[PDB]
Inverse folding.
């Protein structure tokens, strides 16, 4: 799919081109989810290991909520780029090959005659 | 195992898939497959129980002949194109061989007989590696060659696997074999979308790995190879009963959990490509897989099976804990669905 | 390929020898080196989907340098007639088949 | 052909002898050690192969890489031997 | 003579037919040795000496000696089953003859066999005035030009010892 | 040796039943052979003959379901005069279901078989009528 | 090679038919398995030799080196089996049912 | 068609002397006649088609022929002794015959003045300028297909966000 694109960075995580895109707001609901996803991992661990669920490993709880979140910003930063490349790529083609994507014309509903199937 | 040997083997079992993935000269891809075959056989017979020798001798013969067939495809290509690698021009039969062969190493469809049996005689641990770090290698070879393979065969092996996996699983009561059967099924979905959108194969795999790896470390926490054995989970370790419940329903496609996404986007991609015949039948028997998953749910969680007095003794003793990976891979798996858009 | 740890690391342990036109030892050129070049400098920058229709002249030729089947055919065809003609006494190998020998 | 001529005379001479020789006159022995040796033998026999091209490879322009490669092969196999000794292997 | 390679190739096929019919393990081994020699001669016919002779060194006396060796301690005696060795012999002979006519049939389909073109294709091109163009010069790229091909194999052998000892243990 | 099967579709349904029945019978029979083969390779028999019999049983049963399907669908179409009607096929599919049922000596199977097989065949007709594509090439 | 590469290929298929239909002794398979590696080695060497592609001769041998160990593993499994069951016969290998 | 040149076009005189004779004098032929030799060779390499460089080739034989005629005129006896001894050896090795070599080489440095080229100084690459236009498009390469066009611009946050099922994103 998107691989084989000109300029592809053969093994890079997020090419610097992704600098042009806005950075993910740290409180983006998604990163906040990853946070909660993380807290739960922590709590779950405590549970499976039979420790006071919430009052234990308060250091770990932090490692978790802060590892998942850290991961998020840098992942979302990329997935956001990938999607952004997709448009660059998609929109460009629509133009470079314009005829294939012509802007057809839509008639007003007055002209169009849609068959009326009575409900009766 | 003399820890040195453990290192050499483990390195090979790990250099094996990695060479396959990194190289482009098919030959080097073949030896990557060959090294995986050689490295896995020692670990398979670690207990050296009579069942084990049977397991390895089957795994080895099935793996070896497939390896030879993959080499024949590379040897034939070399004469139809001087290149050592499949190209647009490749004779169709040349590629189909590679599909069958690689579908034997991965154990898909009508070649699904070896996996359930080797998964039954190997330890739970080596079971995981045999199921998930040995599927990465062959799949890599296929994903690389996707543009060229046949849409018809893959689909047939895909559908067959789904059915065989499901039907096989319904009867099985041994857990190792229930998982072996599930893997056949999931492996099927993966190979269904390969011709159309390889990138989704890599999602339907990771999710399978993030689902199966927690599931097996669960089976071994209590080292239960029987459902009856996993059913007394409520006494041995009560907390894992909650997540074991969700992970197994996640392995099947039920909608709130992470497991729906792989099936959902594979169905979306197949309908985008117009296989609304194939996709429909797959999704339907996919529902058979959940039936045997929920039957296990019943025994392990929703209903409490009777236990043994000697169990009270095992409770007393501190239970060696499950590694952290269980949690991080249980949650990222049971509930990431709210984050699907970025996964795909 | 699936994980390009080779391009990234810049190493080329597996690419230098994938085609017949790669560096052969002691520069002993392979056979069909006249074509594979012409068939891969053509398909460079043009993806496969379009290395399969328009760059078909160079593969149809490279499919014949190597396999060298059309030649085999033409030749085989020639012999057959020669056999039939030789039957009628029409063709008599010239002594050129056994003439002087050029240095 | 010249070799073929010699060899068939060679078989003929032997078949002649056995023929005249027959015409003129008118369950579980197993020790892993033995299997183990055979195996080691091929691991060494294969290595002999990877070492056989060394006469042509001597003339290789690189030289440094040649020796660096060859020395690594001989050393890693010898270590294989070393572990064979260390382990009960080679101790029959 | 021009069929020298077809014949050798033919005998190879038979040799393999034998192995396939699965005669007694040790006789089958004899079969792989016969095919082995035939094959070596094939490679030694297209101009490759090192590749061929290596087949002999590593595989004819080197590898199958092992096969025969192990087929000496662990494959029992093929006892009470020896009789088939005769039946298998027959099918083999019959199959050989079958193929004999079989290829005649394929030859009929001119649409490869190049019945007339036999001996015109064992070799295709040569550096007539060349000097260093001997099979082997290439096999040595393994030390210099291509070393990956050696580092991978080397690992195999090394790991092999550790693996076999571990399986055997 | 494929231009053949396809012929079934080329001539309008309900017409040239002879060909239809022949083609349908072959496909069933082919499936019979394949099915028997898997049935003999795995779950082997006791004696060569016993297995040859199996092969025959499965082949004939399958050939039969093939025939009646072909015959019923063709005839129904001709009689009902609906050249293209999914139901025609259903009648035929049901027929096959029943045959199979008989060869297995079970009324129940005939029930299972009548609906399921018929439905399936009907869907084939619809599929052809609506130009549904199976095993499609990737066109994304 | 046009028909000399069909004999070798059919040799590999005749060896294919062999490894896939077992009969009694397991050794006969392994042995058969090896018959393929020889056929592959011969075919790889043959085309490399008539393509004058010397850069590829490394492969004909890498194929053998990997195949030899592959077989080493195969035989150790075989010895392991006639140590647990006193025979190499495959029928014995039916516990995993 | 094939436009294969006609025989009359390729009928030129050649040395036609025993390999040994060429070998015995080779060192001096590499000396007295490389100006033209090279040219023919440079023609040969850059214009892969021999047919194109045939003329240069006729010049090659010729230059050598007189090279021989001059040898025939002077120090001929020496040369005769040197080749006869050189020919007897199976690989026609140069070192078995050094006493005979010294005579002829010495003589040609008295009568013809030509000199035996010191170890080397024949292997070194030569520069010969030739009128024949550097063949353009050797390999007769056809036109290279056009590279796919390039999507251009800078990235802008994706439109309306991931457009996955109901994800405002
Ligand atoms: C589609 C979704 C459907 C969801 C429901 C269905 C799917 C889930 C089904 C789960 C059950 C399946 C069947 C399994 C068998 C059940 C019966 C059984 O035998 O269970 C034995 C099992 C025995 O365990 P145990 O011996 O009691 O061990 C614990 C110790 O006693 C020590 O226990 P403790 O008392 O010390 O523990 C105290 C701790 C207990 O904590 C927990 O147990 C957390 C569990 C999280 C599970 C998440 C599942 C998500 C599924 C999707 O308190 C807290 O941590 C408070 C926070 C908990 C929040 C949980 C929900 C958060 C959702 C988000 C809220 C909004 C966002 C802001 C949050 C702000 C928070 C400050 O019973 C359980 O403990 C079940 C634990 C899991 C409950 C999950 C409830 C999820 C509700 C949704
Ligand atoms: C499981 C798989 C394996 C494990 C995973 C492996 C993962 C990595 C795989 C890598 C695969 C190969 C990658 C590289 C090759 C492909 C890419 C490429 O194009 O590189 C070509 C390039 C060719 O060689 P090179 O690195 O250019 O040669 C060094 C200099 O350029 C030479 O230029 P030079 O003019 O300086 O010549 C040197 C000469 C120069 O002498 C003079 O001319 C004197 C006058 C000038 C003086 C100033 C210049 C010289 C200064 C001293 C020499 C420095 C350079 C040489 C250094 C040698 C040691 C690196 O002085 C010497 O003779 C030094 C001799 C040192 C002998 C060391 C013997 C060690 C034996 C083993 C001991 C136990 C281990 O790289 C190589 O092929 C060699 C490195 C790779 C070796 C094989 C793979 C090793 C890794 C696997 C080991 C485990 C195998 C298990 C089986
Ligand atoms: C490259 C790609 C290659 C792909 C190759 C795919 C091959 C798939 C075939 C099976 C593969 C190997 C296997 O696992 O089969 C074991 C299977 C084991 O059966 P068995 O051990 O002989 O039966 C034990 C007793 O003899 C059972 O007692 P029984 O034999 O008395 O029970 C049957 C009885 C009563 O029968 C019944 O009441 C049930 C009838 C069910 C009919 C439909 C079955 C197949 C459904 C496919 C969907 O009627 C009969 O006796 C036979 C009458 C003649 C029937 C002829 C039917 C030919 C079907 C050919 C199907 C070919 C694949 C489609 O061998 C087969 O029978 C093979 C055909 C049916 C396989 C089971 C269904 C699997 C379907 C998965 C999806 C396949 C289609 C979509 C893809
Ligand atoms: C056991 C529990 C589960 C069982 C019960 C619930 C079952 C739910 C099953 C759901 C199954 C379908 C899965 C997809 C759900 C919808 C996905 C979706 O909406 O995607 C588009 C959405 C993007 O648009 P949006 O977030 O709807 O737009 C909101 C505006 O941007 C406005 O937002 P903003 O940009 O202003 O965001 C800033 C906002 C913080 O941002 C948020 O937390 C927003 C949370 C709600 C997002 C809207 C969906 C609500 C669904 C409920 O303010 C802060 O930063 C406060 C400090 C950070 C939070 C501190 C408190 C944390 C604990 C509370 O992506 C996400 O929502 C990512 C988060 C994951 C979905 C919500 C959580 C999953 C559903 C509940 C699970 C509870 C565990
Ligand atoms: C709505 C769907 C309604 C389907 C019919 C409902 C009633 C079915 C019924 O009553 O019979 C169940 C059947 C009884 O059969 P029984 O008498 O037990 O004899 C079995 C002999 N093998 O149960 C059985 O034991 C036999 C089950 C037979 C299952 C296979 C029948 C053919 C299936 C073809 C599926 C489609 C194949 C092509 C695609
Ligand atoms: C095949 C077609 C698909 C399968 C059809 C049969 C499905 C049912 C199988 C039942 C079990 C096997 C016996 C019946 C099939 C058969 O032909 O025998 C295979 C043979 C069995 O060996 P054995 O252990 O003696 O079993 C005797 C059982 N009464 O095992 C062997 O033959 C071992 C050697 C295999 C390779 C032999 C040589 C093959 C090539 C011969 C020449 C070319 C023939 C081309 C046709």
């Amino acid at each position: 799919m998107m691989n084989g694109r000109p300029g592809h960075e053969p093994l890079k995580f997020l090419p610097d081109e992704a600098r042009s895109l806005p950075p993910p707001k740290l409180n983006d609901p998604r990163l906040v989810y990853m946070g909660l996803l993380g807290y739960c991992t922590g709590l779950m661990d405590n549970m499976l290991r039979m420790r006071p669920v919430m009052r234990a490993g308060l250091h770990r709880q932090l490692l978790f909520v802060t590892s998942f979140v850290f991961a998020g910003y840098f992942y979302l930063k990329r997935q956001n780029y990938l999607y952004a490349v997709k448009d660059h790529d998609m929109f460009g083609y629509i133009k470079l090959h314009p005829e294939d994507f012509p802007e057809k014309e839509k008639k007003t509903y007055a002209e169009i005659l849609e068959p009326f199937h009575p409900v009766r | 195992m003399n820890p040195i040997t453990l290192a050499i083997i483990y390195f090979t079992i790990f250099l094996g898939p990695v060479i396959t993935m990194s190289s482009t000269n098919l030959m080097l891809m073949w030896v990557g497959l060959e090294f995986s075959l050689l490295a896995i056989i020692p670990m398979l017979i670690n207990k050296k129980n009579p069942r084990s020798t049977e397991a390895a001798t089957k795994y080895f013969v099935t793996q070896a002949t497939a390896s030879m067939i993959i080499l024949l495809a590379i040897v034939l290509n070399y004469k139809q194109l001087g290149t050592w690698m499949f190209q647009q021009q490749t004779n169709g039969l040349i590629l189909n061989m590679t599909l069958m062969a690689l579908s034997m190493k991965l154990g898909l469809a009508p070649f699904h007989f070896w996996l359930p049996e080797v998964t039954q005689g190997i330890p739970l641990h080596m079971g995981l590696i045999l199921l998930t770090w040995q599927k990465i290698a062959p799949l890599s070879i296929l994903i690389q060659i996707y543009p060229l393979l046949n849409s018809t065969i893959i689909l047939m092996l895909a559908i067959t696997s789904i059915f065989m996996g499901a039907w096989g699983g319904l009867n099985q009561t041994q857990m190792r074999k229930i998982m072996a059967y599930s893997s056949i099924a999931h492996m099927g979905w993966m190979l269904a979308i390969l011709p159309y959108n390889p990138s989704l194969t890599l999602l339907n795999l990771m999710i399978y790995i993030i689902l199966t790896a927690p599931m097996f470390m669960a089976l071994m926490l209590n080292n239960s190879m029987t459902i009856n054995s996993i059913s007394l989970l409520w006494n041995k370790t009560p907390a894992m009963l909650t997540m074991i419940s969700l992970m197994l329903l996640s392995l099947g496609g039920l909608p709130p959990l992470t497991g729906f996404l792989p099936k959902w986007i594979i169905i979306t991609e197949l309908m985008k490509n117009n296989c609304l015949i194939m996709a429909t039948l797959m999704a339907m028997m996919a529902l058979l897989n959940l039936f045997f998953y929920t039957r296990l749910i019943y025994s392990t969680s929703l209903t409490m099976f009777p236990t043994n007095n000697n169990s009270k003794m095992m409770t007393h003793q501190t239970k060696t804990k499950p590694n952290l990976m269980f949690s991080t891979l249980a949650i990222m798996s049971t509930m990431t669905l709210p984050l699907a858009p970025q996964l795909i | 390929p699936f994980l390009d740890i080779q391009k990234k690391l810049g190493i080329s342990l597996d690419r230098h020898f994938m085609f017949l036109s790669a560096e052969q030892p002691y520069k002993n050129a392979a056979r069909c080196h006249a074509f594979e070049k012409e068939w891969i400098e053509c398909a460079h920058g043009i993806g496969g989907t379009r290395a399969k229709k328009e760059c078909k002249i160079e593969f149809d030729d490279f499919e014949e340098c190597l396999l060298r089947y059309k030649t085999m055919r033409r030749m085989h065809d020639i012999k057959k007639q020669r056999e039939k003609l030789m039957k009628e006494g029409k063709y008599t190998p010239p002594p050129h088949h056994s003439g002087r020998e050029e240095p | 052909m010249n070799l073929y001529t010699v060899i068939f005379i060679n078989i003929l001479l032997s078949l002649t002898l056995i023929l005249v020789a027959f015409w003129l006159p008118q369950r579980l022995p197993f020790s892993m050690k033995f299997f183990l040796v055979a195996i080691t033998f091929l691991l060494f026999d294969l290595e002999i192969a990877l070492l056989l091209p060394l006469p042509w490879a001597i003339q290789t322009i690189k030289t440094s890489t040649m020796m660096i490669m060859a020395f690594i092969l001989v050393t890693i196999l010898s270590l294989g031997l070393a572990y064979e000794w260390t382990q009960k292997g080679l101790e029959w | 003579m021009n069929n020298y390679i077809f014949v050798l190739s033919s005998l190879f096929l038979v040799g393999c037919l034998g192995l396939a019919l699965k005669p007694s393990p040790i006789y089958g081994g004899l079969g792989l040795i016969v095919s082995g020699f035939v094959g070596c001669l094939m490679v030694l016919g297209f101009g490759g000496s090192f590749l061929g002779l290596m087949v002999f060194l590593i595989y004819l006396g080197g590898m199958l000696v092992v096969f025969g060796y192990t087929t000496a301690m662990a494959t029992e005696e093929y006892p009470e089953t020896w009789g088939s060795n005769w039946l298998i012999l027959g099918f083999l002979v019959l199959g050989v003859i079958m193929e004999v006519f079989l290829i005649c049939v394929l030859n009929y389909y001119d649409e490869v066999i190049n019945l007339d073109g036999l001996g015109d294709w064992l070799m295709y091109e040569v550096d007539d005035v060349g000097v260093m163009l001997e099979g082997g010069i290439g096999v040595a790229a393994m030390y210099s030009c291509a070393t990956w091909m050696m580092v991978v194999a080397g690992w195999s052998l090394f790991a092999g010892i550790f693996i076999i000892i571990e399986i055997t243990r | 040796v494929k231009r053949f099967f396809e012929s079934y579709h080329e001539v309008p349904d309900g017409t040239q039943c002879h060909r239809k029945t022949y083609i349908t019978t072959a496909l069933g029979g082919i499936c019979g052979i394949i099915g028997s083969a898997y049935s003999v390779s795995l779950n082997p028999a006791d004696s060569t003959l016993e297995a040859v019999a199996r092969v025959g049983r499965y082949t004939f049963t399958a050939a039969a379901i093939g025939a009646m399907f072909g015959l019923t669908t063709c005839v129904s179409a001709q009689v009902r005069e609906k050249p293209d009607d999914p139901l025609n096929y259903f009648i035929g599919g049901c027929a096959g279901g029943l045959t199979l049922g008989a060869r297995t000596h079970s009324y129940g199977t005939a029930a299972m078989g009548c609906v399921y097989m018929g439905t399936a065949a009907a869907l084939f007709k619809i599929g052809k009528l609506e130009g549904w594509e199976l095993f499609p090439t990737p066109k994304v | 090679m046009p028909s000399t590469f069909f004999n070798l290929t059919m040799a590999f298929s005749l060896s294919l038919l062999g490894t896939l239909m077992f009969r009694s002794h397991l050794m006969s398979t392994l042995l058969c398995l090896e018959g393929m590696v020889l056929s592959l080695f011969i075919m790889t060497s043959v085309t490399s030799l008539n393509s004058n592609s010397m850069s590829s001769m490394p492969i004909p041998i890498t194929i053998l080196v990997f195949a030899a160990c592959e077989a080493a593993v195969g035989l150790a499994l075989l010895v392991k089996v006639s140590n647990t069951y006193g025979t190499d016969y495959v029928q014995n290998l039916n516990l995993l049912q | 068609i094939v436009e294969l040149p006609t025989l009359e076009e390729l009928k030129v005189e050649e040395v036609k002397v025993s390999s040994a004779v060429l070998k015995a004098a080779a060192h001096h032929y590499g000396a007295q006649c490389d100006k033209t030799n090279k040219e023919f060779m440079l023609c040969r390499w850059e214009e892969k088609d021999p047919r194109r460089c045939l003329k240069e080739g006729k010049l090659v034989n010729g230059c050598a022929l007189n090279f021989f005629r001059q040898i025939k005129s002077h120090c001929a006896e020496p040369f005769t002794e040197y080749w006869t001894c050189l020919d007897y050896s199976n690989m026609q090795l140069f070192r078995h015959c050094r006493q005979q070599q010294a005579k002829f080489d010495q003589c040609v440095l008295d009568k013809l003045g030509w000199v035996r080229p010191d170890l080397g100084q024949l292997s070194k690459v030569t520069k010969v300028k030739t009128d024949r236009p550097l063949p353009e498009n050797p390999y007769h390469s056809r036109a290279r297909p056009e590279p796919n066009p390039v999507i251009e611009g800078d990235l802008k946050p994706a439109k309306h966000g991931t457009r996955f099922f109901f994800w405002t994103v």
